[PDB]
């Protein structure tokens, strides 16, 4: 009865994981345009309304490669509030 049941829990997982397969496109699309909306929306802050300093480029990368750097929490919403900063830092780790 643990043979025939544990098999089914796998059969339900495949049912439950293939659901996740169908929605990677929608999420990855939202996640791309979202994080690609954060850091233009940090640039415009950093372009004119701030940064009238000496020699300073505003869209300035720190690489020679020209490829896409996946941004990160320290850059992406690194200058929102702390609670929005403390929600990927310590979001899932601190129990939903």
């Amino acid at each position: 009865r643990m043979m025939r049941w544990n098999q089914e829990r796998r059969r339900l997982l495949i049912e439950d994981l293939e659901a996740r397969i169908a929605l990677m496109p929608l999420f990855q699309a939202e996640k791309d345009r979202r994080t690609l909306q954060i850091l233009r929306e940090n640039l415009e802050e950093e372009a004119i309304i701030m940064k009238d300093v000496p020699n300073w480029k505003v869209g300035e990368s720190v690489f020679h490669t020209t490829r896409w750097v996946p941004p990160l929490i320290g850059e992406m919403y690194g200058l929102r509030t702390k609670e929005e900063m403390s929600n990927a830092n310590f979001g899932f780790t601190w129990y939903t």
């Binding site: 996740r20 999420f27 939202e30 929600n87 979001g91 899932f92 939903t96």
Partner: protein, 67 residues
């Protein structure tokens, strides 16, 4: 006789049902009639933090009716 033990049990026996049945009704009240919606993986947390962003900041609501 031995039936004098039942008070010690059936008063202990109305004392360990509470932390089970109170743990759900307190979740449903806070979670909107649903369950606590635990998150073990990084995907179930994404759905929350998505659903947290499709409404007011509480995430136990809006779905279809929008577009």
């Amino acid at each position: 006789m031995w039936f004098e033990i039942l008070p010690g049990l059936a008063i202990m026996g109305v004392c360990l049902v509470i932390p089970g049945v109170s743990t759900a009704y307190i979740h449903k009240f806070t979670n909107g009639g649903k369950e606590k919606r635990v998150a073990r993986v990084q995907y179930q947390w994404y759905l929350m933090e998505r659903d947290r962003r499709i409404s007011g900041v509480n995430r136990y609501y809006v779905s279809k009716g929008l577009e």
